[PDB]
């Protein structure tokens, strides 16, 4: 039962499982880091045990399938979106030809967690808060793709390894700077991170959609949010900061350093920036970031076509 | 290795199911749902035909089809909201005033 094809497929499966487990544990440790900066591993294990052994109470007048399905979406959407990220040469889960399109697929599916939690939580205030949150996430998902499309235009393909190889000389943060800032804003706003934390706080007729979620479903929402910011940071690294490319260190060391830097910067901008008003956020999205992505795509195309003799 | 007949039969089954949902359902929302099923089935049939010939025209026809699907879903849901706010009733048999 020994054959190098079986050894190769088993080692690739083992690499994918290792990547998955490291991402989940890093999401849990980032939850710990945010809760402490604003043993610890033993405290997180205690939290997991407490959420396991607390009774899961689904409300009586609530739809069971939608209520159960919302945290599953909130976890699995961006946790599956991680699968295209190349962390090292020969350490990618899926070398998909669609790549960043697969990430867009997963984010578009990720809005359903908020919508389903708000509808299934049988409360009018929670429904209104979820409607506001979903309107905000649509307002920033409208330009997430175009902010990526500048980098896609420079690389000439949707594949992530091709983007990393095309960032061999100069990282895409320099030419695609406006794409970088728009993608950072859209990635923060899709994951409901600060300053886009609580759109329901602007009205007393609305409530957060995480209310009525107790125990393991609340834990799924929590760890899913942190895993979402982990995969957003990894995509940011692979799309604008060379991925695994560096002069001296091993490639995984460079990728891990850049991803940890971006996770800490997300923590810092949570601790520092104040949250704007809801209409300010919606207006800023629809009126500034979408035209900026369109103009950045036009300018990138003009520069690419000029610099091709 | 996948036959063209099987893909076209799958698209035909989905189209027929969407048409049945459009006919038998009295709620206007489910009529819009059946319309979406029908247009998605026709777009799937175009994708199957394009993949059989190895041409990109099937996916282009899919793109035009889903542009139509998005725009007419927007229009139909706007009309559904107008009907709801003017009558508080989504029964499609109630909006039948003009007759021969």
């Amino acid at each position: 039962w020994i054959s190098p094809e079986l050894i190769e497929i088993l080692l690739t499966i083992l690499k994918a499982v290792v990547i998955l487990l490291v991402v989940v544990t890093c999401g849990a440790f980032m939850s710990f880091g945010e809760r402490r900066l604003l043993g610890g591993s033993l405290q997180l294990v205690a939290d997991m045990i407490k959420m396991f052994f607390k009774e899961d109470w689904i409300p009586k007048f609530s739809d069971r399938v939608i209520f159960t399905l919302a945290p599953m979406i909130a976890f699995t959407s961006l946790l599956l979106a991680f699968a295209i990220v190349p962390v090292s040469p020969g350490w990618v889960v899926a070398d998909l030809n669609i790549g960043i399109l697969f990430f867009l697929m997963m984010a578009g599916l990720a809005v359903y967690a908020v919508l389903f939690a708000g509808w299934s939580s049988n409360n009018k205030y929670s429904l209104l808060g979820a409607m506001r949150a979903s309107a905000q996430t649509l307002s920033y998902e409208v330009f997430l793709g175009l902010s990526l499309m500048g980098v896609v235009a420079q690389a000439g393909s949707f594949n992530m390894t091709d983007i990393v190889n095309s960032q061999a000389h100069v990282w895409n943060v320099i030419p695609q700077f406006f794409g970088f800032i728009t993608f950072a804003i859209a990635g923060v706003a899709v994951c409901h991170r600060h300053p886009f934390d609580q759109p329901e706080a602007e009205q007393e007729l609305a409530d957060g959609y995480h209310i009525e979620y107790s125990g393991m479903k609340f834990g799924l929402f929590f760890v899913g949010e942190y895993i979402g910011i982990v995969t957003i940071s990894a995509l940011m690294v692979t799309l604008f900061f060379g991925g695994w490319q560096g002069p001296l260190l091993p490639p995984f060391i460079w990728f891990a350093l850049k991803t940890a830097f971006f996770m800490m910067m997300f923590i810092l901008i949570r601790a520092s920036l104040p949250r704007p008003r809801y209409d300010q956020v919606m207006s800023f999205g629809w009126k500034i970031c979408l035209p900026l992505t369109l103009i950045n795509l036009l300018v990138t195309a003009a520069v690419i076509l000029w610099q091709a003799q | 290795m996948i036959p063209l007949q099987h893909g076209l039969i799958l698209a035909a089954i989905l189209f027929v199911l969407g048409l049945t949902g459009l006919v038998i359902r009295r709620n206007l929302l489910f009529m819009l749902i059946g319309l979406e099923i029908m247009i998605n089935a026709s777009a799937l049939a175009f994708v199957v035909a394009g993949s059989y010939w190895g041409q990109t025209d099937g996916q282009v026809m899919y793109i035009l089809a889903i542009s139509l699907a998005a725009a007419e879903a927007s229009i139909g849901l706007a009309l559904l909201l107008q009907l709801h706010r003017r009558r508080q009733n989504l029964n499609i048999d109630s909006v039948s005033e003009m007759r021969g």
Binding site: - | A11, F15, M38, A41, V60, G76, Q82, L83, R86
Partner: protein, 480 residues
């Protein structure tokens, strides 16, 4: 293929109408002004007519794998542009009575005209589908423009649901045709067949589903039941556009599809279209017999007249002058329908709000609106195929084309349906002059009156002297 500058010259009405859409939309974004945006729309459409002159000064050529421009396309572009200009002119007083936003109307009319132009030049299944949808969706908006009124909302919902279903049928038929034949162009539908194998079952099923969609769009039996409800519920300028421009553009692209496709001369499709034409003529005339509502009556009239046009289409792959007959009939039908629906629009303008009634009440119209009554009775005689009217010249063309192709069942159908039309059209035209017991002052209403008067004068003059229209249509021939 790439677009040379000459190809850009051949796209001139399409480019001018698209630029007018952009300019009118930006003007609305600047300031919501009814007069300026209506003026910009009509200026763009007139510039598209002059661009048609410039296109005629160029050649006839295939601008894309998708579009082909020739005299056929120029004639149908002119008809669609005339219908859109008349619709805007009739719309201004009616929208002057309106209370909400009244410039999105002109934006939607421009986009529907753009779809009509695309269908006029459509040489491809993609361009056919896109032109039908560009006609349809602005008409979803326009039919329910006064959505606070019950009838307009009802007509909008019916038209939207049924046109989405018909577009699904048309798209599924196109997909089956593309599954059979590897190319989506008109000239290649049935090209890969021979030795009596033209009636491939998948190709025939695809053309059948396309026939379902197009026959919905053309109000052909048995896809005709929407027509009186939507015609009655829509605003009267919207009813004018829906009767003229949509039907003319969709029938033109159907004419070109059946001219260019090698499966066009199929016996099965010809027999099915003969059944549909027979049923359309007889059913439209029979259902219009006992109508007191003028708009429902004109809907059934549209069913029967599209049946006559379909009779002219059936003889296309056998005779020669079927294209000339369709052109002459479509010019006459356009002017008659513009006059009739314009009288209906002018007497229902300004808009009386969603709560007030909108019945025409045409009895005794002569004793307070004599000129509009004269225009309406000229149009009623023209739709009846009475000699000294252009409608008779079109009917004579249809009869000659049917006699040349030995379509005797369709000839007898035209005769019987014409007699039934005589009854109900004469009922309307003589009710115009009776006595009714009981039941303006701006230049745009006068412009609408001038439009219906010029349509009446064109109908009378070209019914007496039809040689200029025949000479114009005969030089507007497509690529052979």
């Amino acid at each position: 293929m790439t677009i040379t500058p000459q190809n850009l010259i051949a796209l001139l009405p399409l480019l001018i109408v698209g630029l007018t859409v952009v300019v009118v939309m930006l003007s609305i974004a600047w300031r919501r002004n009814h007069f300026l945006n209506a003026t910009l729309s009509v200026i763009g459409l007139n510039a598209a007519l002059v661009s048609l002159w410039f296109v005629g000064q160029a050649g006839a050529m295939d601008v894309t794998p998708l579009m082909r421009v020739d005299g056929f396309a120029m004639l149908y572009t002119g008809l669609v542009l005339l219908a859109s200009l008349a619709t805007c002119t009739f719309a201004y007083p009616w929208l002057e009575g309106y209370n909400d936003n009244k410039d999105e109307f002109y934006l939607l009319v421009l986009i529907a005209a753009l779809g009509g132009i695309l269908l006029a030049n459509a040489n491809h299944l993609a361009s056919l589908f896109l032109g039908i949808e560009l006609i349809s969706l602005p008409l979803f908006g326009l039919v329910g423009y006064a959505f606070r009124q019950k009838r307009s909302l009802e007509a909008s919902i019916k038209y939207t649901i049924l046109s989405a279903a018909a577009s699904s049928f048309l798209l599924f038929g196109m997909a089956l045709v593309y599954a059979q034949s590897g190319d989506l162009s008109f000239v290649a539908l049935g090209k890969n067949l021979g030795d009596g194998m033209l009636n491939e079952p998948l190709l025939l099923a695809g053309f059948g589903l396309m026939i379902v969609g197009l026959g919905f769009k053309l109000s052909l039996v048995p896809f005709h039941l929407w027509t009186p409800d939507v015609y009655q519920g829509a605003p009267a300028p919207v009813s004018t556009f829906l009767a003229t421009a949509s039907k003319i553009a969709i029938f033109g692209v159907v004419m070109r599809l059946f001219l260019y496709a090698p499966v066009g001369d199929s016996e099965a499709i010809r027999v099915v279209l003969a059944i549909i034409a027979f049923a359309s003529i007889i059913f439209g005339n029979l259902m219009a017999l006992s109508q007191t509502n003028i708009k429902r009556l004109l809907g059934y009239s549209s069913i029967s007249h599209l049946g006559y046009l379909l009779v002219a289409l059936i003889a296309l792959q056998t005779g020669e002058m079927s294209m000339e007959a369709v052109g002459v009939y479509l010019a006459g039908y356009l002017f008659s329908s513009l006059g009739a629906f314009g009288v209906v629009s002018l007497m229902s303008s300004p808009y009386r709000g969603p709560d007030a009634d909108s019945l025409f009440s045409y009895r005794g119209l002569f004793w307070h609106r004599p000129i509009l009554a004269a225009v309406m009775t000229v149009m009623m005689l023209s739709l009846a195929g009475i000699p000294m009217t252009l409608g008779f010249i079109g009917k004579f063309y249809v009869l000659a084309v049917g006699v040349q192709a030995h379509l005797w069942w369709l000839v007898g159908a035209v005769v019987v349906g014409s007699a039934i039309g005589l009854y109900y059209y004469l009922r309307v035209a003589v009710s115009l002059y009776l006595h009714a017991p009981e039941q303006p002052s701006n230049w745009q209403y006068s412009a609408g009156g001038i439009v219906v008067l010029i349509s009446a004068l064109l109908v009378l003059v070209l019914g007496v002297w039809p040689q200029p229209l025949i000479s114009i249509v005969r030089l507007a021939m497509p690529l052979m």
